[PDB]
A and B are shown apart, each in its own frame.
Chain A
């Protein structure tokens, strides 16, 4: 078989007579009915330019014997046939030779009557099918020899009997014949403008979430043939199918054809763009419907590569391969998008991945990026994905690789922060995760990962419970979280506005337990830089933080080790804040509160201090009176 060339279809649409000349003979043979109707029928428009176009059509007309046959077809009266068809239809509502042989031997009007009766019977069958797809057999339409003239006569009937033969009805009924795709392609090619209308009719009359039924396969193949006929308008069908929420297989297939057509490796693949949009698109109905498609595709255990799902998965894996090499610079953002896309596929759709897929994902996630802002974001998404999907790591090999990667990170957590310049969102995130693990807030861990990933997916607590051993036992211990806490950057412009769980909460929690003094880490260097930085209004944590800090400066961690004592801030350091006005208002009010509370606590808890004999620096009158 041969379909109408896309160039031929576009030439017909643009009524480009000169291009009609360029068209080859078989294309003209396929397109004859419209052309001859154009050349013979009385011209609707009577412009001289159109007259010359008609002269060109006549120039092209020669070389076809079927022209005479089509003229004979047109010769037959149509009013009588129409009334007969109406009466027969009403009756329906209330030959020794095969149909092909009858079509052949009988004359043109008999051919019209036969084909018209057959099509109307098919239409009635479809109308009564109540949406149940079936198949109808007709040797006439299944005869390869008589295909051409069958289609020719059908085109004339459609042109001449609009009311009796609505185009969309003809299309949907025709779907049920063996070569309905080919008849439909030729018929639509005959009348260009109806292309989009037929596209709408088929999609509307299609099913919702079935790509395995024979009807679904036939319908999607017909639409694919139409798109191949008109590539320029293909993506309109894509938008239509996305809107109507039918035939997701067709929706993805169109995208596969378009991405094959276009080759732009510089940017992310339009496939990635589209699937990311559908899954993460703000809409909800589309999200649920597409998730249903993925669920059905995976639940179909049979491994058939002709499946659009499998084609799409192969395409995504191959796209990932080009990215995967450390890691190149410009590839960071593109890798991030694919990482999030697969995160969605496993989480918000339950796309069970194969072993090689898991291997490639592990490789990418463990890949070292450059310490740029994009690298910071990419490592954040990588670690969060590993947090969420523990099933990605099963064998001790991936376990060891992951542990190695995390160990490499922990030395570069704050180093990454400084190199990138931006506040280390992951740098505080790692501290947060470690604290949440040690204190068994798996719900909070889930909440954090969902937020950072940007998609609310479901996680089994046991999955994280497994990794808890990996996390709290060797990679992160008390004296390691202690190491991180002091080096974490201080929160900028702190206030009550910045909501969530800021590092101040974690510092306060650590000081509650007095880990800092146990593991000999100075903390004033941090608290002072934070208090120099706070602004208005006041975050509800600072005051309890200062209280616990001063209580630590005075009281020891343990009786057996009286030496446990944080260093109080230096008076010279205090002076700078009050020298004036480089600082804020709440900047120095907190420090005034701290100094007053400290002078008070010295006298209040002087018993244990006398027991220790580590009397700290009582500040000089020079400072105490210079304070306004």
Chain B
């Protein structure tokens, strides 16, 4: 109250940083912050913008669940007070970042009728659709399987428009790789959830009839108390594991985000792997798993309320599943209930689009212009087939921003492989070298041996590696085609022999 609009920005930054840890630090102080917010338009004019955005961040942080009339009051405050398009964009960004998706859709709608170039219009529309889908998802009811499927289907009906728009927004410049891929895998996750919920609901869809009719129920050959749902449970378990590994691909491909987006992605992978483990250890052989969750759990080390809530949900699911491991037969009497409750819990915490999604920093890349016998077109290159080939893979690492903001490249693990174009598919020549870039530049001599007539594909993969030691799969992954021919002297020798 007593800060004269100069120290207020600093104090609000401090408060947001503090509230990022404990929720009771934000839950009960809702009204007073808005009392501060409402008087902004008149108490200053020189730098209204910065304190406006700061107050928006703090209010969103405090607001855990949703926004009341305070919402429309914020909207008007922006409308009457000087409110730059850039400013409203930043408030919308912070809203989306903290999860209060309800405000995001409204603000981005106002934005849409702005901007000049189509790229930004498409990007804004995509973000609006994403936020609206998240808002629709938030309206979930605890323990009611009927509404869950409809809500999920609707939110997916919106993510698809979102993906279309976002894919359109891309350009040769700043092709939104992480943004697009992360959201696409998010739709994949939700589709997996929809399929799983449908399967468990169909459990009652005359499943027992199949197994008993096919074979005697006692000592069931298809499975222990076999049922048609066993095949679908195998299918979805496999799909969930595959999705989990696809997050692995995204994570080991980013390499650029801060230590926040990475933790978020790891968290999503943890959720996926959790559903997989639950379905596998509860529906499939439970005695085979027979693994106890005997590890340190629940230590308050999380860096965000979002992470804390997810860790709480995980612990709830584990403490339920451990108890319910052996109680019933695999017939899945109440196991469906546990699965459904886990799904509802997982969807309850809405989302948080993390920084790397918005605004990219520490731009690093590998040029990797190999210099074999150069091939202007894709015309394959020749080698007598009896001697050898040498590549001379040349690579230079280029930093746009502060070279080492978070992770500094330590080594480049060039991996070269060949395959037979016309057909272990001829991976005899598959090798790797860990060249350290001394200044910015690294060359590597690679030798490829091969004695087959057909063409060959040569693939080189970069796989940068940082100080701590991680794969961090990146790199252009360039290819070169190489022809193979033999001297007629040897041709006649082989013919005669």
Contacts and interface: CB of A to CB of B under 8 A. Distances in A.
Q: Do chains A and B touch in the complex (CB under 8 A)?
A: yes
Interface in B115-160: 115-118, 121-122, 125, 145-146, 149-150, 153-154, 156-157, 160
Nearest to B166: A277
Contacts of B437: none
Given A41-B206, A280-B170, 9 more contacts: A37-B206, A38-B204, A46-B333, A78-B213, A270-B161, A281-B167, A330-B113, A337-B122, A377-B116
A574 to B, nearest CB: 36
B209 interface: yes
B199 A193 contact: yes
Interface stretch (B39-47, B228-236, B311-319, B366-374): B228-236
A233 B232 CA distance: 19
B205 A277 contact: no
Most chain B CB within a 10 A radius of its CB, from A46, A79, A274, A372: A274
Contacts of B286: none
A193 B206 contact: no
Interface residues of A, number: 58
Interface in A227-247: 232-233, 235-236, 238-239
B488 interface: no
Given A267-B112, A330-B113, A44 B203 contact: yes
Contacts of A336: 117-118
Nearest to A261: B157
B354 to A, nearest CB: 21
Interface string A199-235: 0000000000000000000000000000000001101
A373 B116 contact: yes
A454 B113 CA distance: 22
Interface in A176-190: none
A549 B238 CA distance: 73
B331 A44 contact: yes
B117 A15 contact: no
Interface in B199-216: 199, 201-210, 212-215
Contacts of B171: 280, 282, 454
17 contacts: A14-B145, A14-B150, A34-B205, A38-B205, A42-B209, A45-B333, A45-B336, A82-B214, A159-B209, A235-B160, A273-B164, A276-B168, A277-B167, A278-B167, A332-B116, A337-B118, A337-B121
A160 interface: yes
Contacts of B295: none
A163 B336 CA distance: 24
Nearest to B197: A193
Contacts of B207: 44
Given A45-B336, A235-B157, A159 B232 contact: no
A333 B163 contact: no
Contacts of B213: 78, 160
Nearest to A272: B168
B211 to A, nearest CB: 9
A385 interface: no
Interface residues of B, number: 60
Given A45-B333, A376-B116, A160 B170 contact: no
A340 B171 CA distance: 13
Contacts of B209: 37, 41-42, 159-160
Contacts of A278: 167
A467 interface: no
A236 B117 contact: no
A161 B117 CA distance: 58
B75 interface: no
A277 B214 contact: no
Contacts of B177: 282
B170 A281 contact: yes
Given A44-B331, A78-B214, A280-B168, A273 B161 contact: yes
A282 B163 CA distance: 13
Interface in B427-486: none
Contacts of B227: 44
B198 interface: yes
B129 to A, nearest CB: 10
Nearest to B195: A196
B206 A159 contact: yes
B154 A232 contact: yes
A278 B117 CA distance: 19
Given A239-B160, A277-B165, A197 B235 contact: yes
A162 B175 contact: no
Nearest to B212: A42
Contact of B206 (A16, A34, A46, A276): A34
Given A280-B170, A373-B116, A454-B171, A13 B149 contact: yes
B72 to A, nearest CB: 21
- Max chain A Cβ within 10 angstroms of own Cβ: one of B115, B228, B235: B228
B198 to A, nearest CB: 5
Contacts of B176: 282
A270 B122 CA distance: 11
Given A192-B202, A232-B154, A273 B168 contact: yes
A373 B85 CA distance: 14
B243 to A, nearest CB: 14
Contact of A239 (B187, B231, B232): B187
B205 A192 contact: yes
Contacts of B117: 336, 377
A616 interface: no
A374 interface: yes
Contacts of B146: 14, 16
A337 B112 CA distance: 14
A32 to B, nearest CB: 13
Contacts of B71: none
A461 interface: no
Interface in A86-127: none
Contacts of A238: 160
Contacts of A144: none
B223 to A, nearest CB: 12
Nearest to A283: B167
Given A333-B115, A372-B116, A274 B164 contact: yes
Nearest to B200: A193
A26 interface: no
A191 B231 CA distance: 14
Which residue among B125, B160, B171, B212 has the maximum number of chain A CB atoms within 10 Å of its CB?
Answer: B160
A407 B374 CA distance: 49
B377 interface: no
Interface string A248-285: 00000000000000000001101001101110111100
B31 interface: no
Contacts of A235: 156-157, 160-161
A193 B165 CA distance: 29
Contacts of A191: 202, 205
A496 to B, nearest CB: 16
B210 A162 contact: yes
Given A160-B214, A267-B112, A333 B164 contact: no
Contacts of B215: 79
B172 interface: yes
A123 to B, nearest CB: 18
B426 interface: no
B153 A232 contact: yes
A35 to B, nearest CB: 10
Contacts of B242: none
Contacts of A332: 116
A15 B154 CA distance: 18
Contacts of A196: 191, 195
B172 to A, nearest CB: 7
B204 A15 contact: yes
A192 B202 CA distance: 8
| Most chain A CB within a 10 A radius of its CB, from B116, B177, B231 | B116
A390 B116 CA distance: 26
A50 interface: yes
A159 B210 CA distance: 7
Nearest to A50: B204
A282 B213 CA distance: 52
B176 to A, nearest CB: 8
